[PDB]
UniProtKB/Swiss-Prot annotation, chain A:
Name of the coding gene: PRP8
Effect the entry attributes to changing residue 23 to A: Reduced growth at 30 degrees Celsius. Strongly reduced growth at 16 degrees Celsius
Extra information: Present with 468 molecules/cell in log phase SD medium.
Role of this protein: Functions as a scaffold that mediates the ordered assembly of spliceosomal proteins and snRNAs. Required for association of BRR2 with the spliceosomal U5 snRNP, and the subsequent assembly of the U4/U6-U5 tri-snRNP complex. Functions as a scaffold that positions spliceosomal U2, U5 and U6 snRNAs at splice sites on pre-mRNA substrates, so that splicing can occur. Interacts with both the 5' and the 3' splice site, as well as the branch region. Has a role in branch site-3' splice site selection. Associates with the branch site-3' splice 3'-exon region. Also has a role in cell cycle.
Comment text on domains: The MPN (JAB/Mov34) domain has structural similarity with deubiquitinating enzymes, but lacks the residues that would bind the catalytic metal ion.
Section of the entire sequence shown: 1836 to 2069 of 2413
Name of the protein this chain belongs to: Pre-mRNA-splicing factor 8
Taxonomic placement: Eukaryota, Fungi, Dikarya, Ascomycota, Saccharomycotina
Superkingdom to which the source organism belongs: Eukaryota
Mutagenesis or variant effect for residue 22 to N: Reduced growth at 30 degrees Celsius. Strongly reduced growth at 16 degrees Celsius
Cellular compartments annotated: Nucleus
Subunit structure: Component of the U4/U6-U5 tri-snRNP complex composed of the U4, U6 and U5 snRNAs and at least PRP3, PRP4, PRP6, PRP8, PRP18, PRP31, PRP38, SNU13, SNU23, SNU66, SNU114, SPP381, SMB1, SMD1, SMD2, SMD3, SMX2, SMX3, LSM2, LSM3, LSM4, LSM5, LSM6, LSM7, LSM8, BRR2 and DIB1.
Region described as RNase H homology domain: spans on this chain: 7-237
From Swiss-Prot, chain B:
Source organism: Saccharomyces cerevisiae (strain ATCC 204508 / S288c)
InterPro entries reported in the protein's UniProt record: AAR2 (IPR007946), AAR2_C (IPR033648), AAR2_C_sf (IPR038514), Aar2_N (IPR033647), AAR2_N_sf (IPR038516)
Gene behind this protein: AAR2
Lineage summary: Eukaryota, Fungi, Dikarya, Ascomycota, Saccharomycotina
GO terms for biological process, alphabetical: spliceosomal snRNP assembly; spliceosomal tri-snRNP complex assembly
Protein name: A1 cistron-splicing factor AAR2
Stored PANTHER family: A1 CISTRON SPLICING FACTOR AAR2-RELATED (PTHR12689), PROTEIN AAR2 HOMOLOG (PTHR12689:SF4)
More info: Present with 7330 molecules/cell in log phase SD medium.
Record function comment: Component of the U5 snRNP complex that is required for spliceosome assembly and for pre-mRNA splicing. Involved in splicing pre-mRNA of the A1 cistron and other genes that are important for cell growth.
Length: 237, 300
């Protein structure tokens, strides 16, 4: 059944699993027409498919051409997500195929179950966790490859950089969720915290700055403070 | 007009014949049911006064043989049996009729209810769903599970309804996942109608049989089968016009006949709301929508 606070350690065991987030697949700008009606313009999206144990991110870029001449795009977006995840599983050698896929939104369950009928032993699960994967497009290098794509493209990243050399996958996932939660709550403030000291750079092969263990503790504190402030604002408490 | 004689009635029991029912007292001189209309299947059903658990009964067609009921004190139930000796049977029935120890099948001349509930139901199809080939009649009860329920445990005592599963390779063509899941027309028309049932009459026959087993025995698996077969039609954008018109009549008579007090356990809220208000066929079941809105507006 559903992934929650109770069965959280299961994410970091030795059973291969992937999280799938579809919240950036179908993306639009809403604008006025000459006649003063409203219309949407699609922009490039992505499927966020993440191994929480290894940090391996399978970023399938969704080019705006996939929506051309299609109806009910928010519904199609769920099925296109399930098609691309199914294609990804089929492309992996048997020993690399996930035993579980956890969808971040319950609306993905039926589309993914139907696309994965050929894999009856792969469990498709919802989660009660409110994961901030929607903020993936606040990571500058992920945003850049999505917006520059001129065709459908899969790009592979490690969303943890080299953190697993120094910390466990539990701690790396906690750091990632806190960074993404901050970026989601106040993007400008989160990015200011990450880049304010110009002496700490992002390696060409990394997503996040090259913080020492001590600098990560300071960064993580600044992100928690950003999140609590913003909360007191939202809720006048 | 055919007759199902009873050897005796040693235990107090409610006896059903089709949509009718009679209370019989322990050792009441009851010797059976006469004037049963030829041309239809019939069901004779039982609920013991001392154990209102296990409704059970027998589907039969009097054209296929001479049937009687005899209580078995070892197995503790009223059993259907075939009398192979024509003269012995005619002589038994004639005596019981002369002594007027039989109830008459109480059909009102105007009343087409039983025809309307059994229009497509045929004994030969019943005998493939309920397997016991040494008998020409079929036993069903409250607790019998379906082949589909068993997959998800005695195969001899199972209801072999056609398995319908919306999230199965059978239902979904590779490369047509979304199309086939949101519009079940290929599953209805190619897999089920052309492939398995051969025609709409056999499909409706199974649907009507599943309803009647749900209603007369509170058979849960039968209720699941009845709903799945309705939902497969209502979830198909492309259905022959004659099938939709016939489905509206079938369901109308089923909803008309259901006891008002059993709507809560025999009607699936999700399926009916989907079929009448969201599905492709939401505007194709006028008679059914009108009786459901007037009789069970709570469910909706």
């Amino acid at each position: 059944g559903a992934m929650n606070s109770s069965n959280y350690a299961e994410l970091f065991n030795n059973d291969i699993k992937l999280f799938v987030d579809d919240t950036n697949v179908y993306r639009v700008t809403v604008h006025k027409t000459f006649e003063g009606n409203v219309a949407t313009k699609a922009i490039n999206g992505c499927i966020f498919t993440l191994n929480p144990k290894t940090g391996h991110l399978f970023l399938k870029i969704i080019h705006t051409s996939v929506w051309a001449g299609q109806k009910r795009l928010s519904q199609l977006a769920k099925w296109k997500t399930a098609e691309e995840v199914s294609a990804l599983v089929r492309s992996l050698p048997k020993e690399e195929q996930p035993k579980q896929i956890i969808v971040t939104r319950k609306a993905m369950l039926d589309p993914l179950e139907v696309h994965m009928l050929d894999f009856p032993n792969i469990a498709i699960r919802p989660t009660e966790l409110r994961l901030p994967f929607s903020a993936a497009m606040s990571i500058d290098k992920l945003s850049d490859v999505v917006m520059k794509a001129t065709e459908p493209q899969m790009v592979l990243f490690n969303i943890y950089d080299d953190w697993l050399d120094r910390i466990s996958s539990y701690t790396a996932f906690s750091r990632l969720t806190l960074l993404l939660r901050a970026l989601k709550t106040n993007e400008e403030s989160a990015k200011m915290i990450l880049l304010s000291d110009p002496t700490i750079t992002i390696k060409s092969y990394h997503l996040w700055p090259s913080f020492t263990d001590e600098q990560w503790i300071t960064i993580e504190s600044q992100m928690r403070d950003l999140i609590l402030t913003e909360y007191g604002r939202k809720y006048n408490v | 007009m055919n007759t199902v004689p009873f050897t005796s009635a040693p235990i107090e029991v409610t006896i059903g014949i089709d949509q009718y029912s009679f209370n019989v007292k322990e050792n009441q001189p009851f010797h059976g049911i006469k004037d049963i209309p030829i041309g239809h299947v019939h069901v004779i059903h039982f609920q013991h006064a001392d154990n209102s658990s296990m409704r059970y009964g027998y589907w039969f067609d009097c054209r296929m043989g001479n049937f009687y009921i005899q209580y078995d004190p070892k197995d503790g139930l009223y059993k259907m049996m075939e009398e192979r000796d024509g003269a012995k049977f005619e002589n038994i029935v004639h005596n019981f009729k002369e002594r007027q120890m039989m109830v008459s099948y109480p059909k009102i001349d105007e009343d087409d209810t039983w025809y309307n509930l059994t229009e497509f139901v045929q004994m030969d199809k019943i005998r493939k769903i309920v397997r016991k080939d040494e008998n020409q009649f079929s036993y069903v009860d409250s607790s019998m599970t379906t082949v589909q329920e068993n997959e998800l445990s005695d195969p001899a005592h199972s209801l072999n309804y056609t398995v319908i599963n919306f999230k199965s390779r059978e239902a979904i063509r590779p490369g047509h996942e979304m199309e086939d899941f949101l519009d079940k027309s290929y599953y209805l028309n190619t897999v089920m109608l052309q492939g398995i049932f051969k025609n709409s009459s056999n499909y409706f026959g199974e649907l009507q049989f599943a309803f009647l087993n749900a209603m007369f025995f509170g058979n849960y698996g039968s209720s699941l089968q009845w709903h799945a077969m309705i939902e497969l039609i209502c979830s198909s954008a492309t259905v022959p016009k004659h099938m939709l018109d016939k489905l509206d009549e079938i369901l109308y008579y089923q909803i008309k006949t259901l006891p008002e007090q059993y709507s809560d356990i025999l009607l699936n809220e999700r399926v009916w709301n989907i079929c009448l208000y969201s599905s492709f066929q939401k505007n194709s079941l006028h008679n059914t929508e009108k009786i459901m809105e007037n009789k069970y507006p709570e469910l909706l």
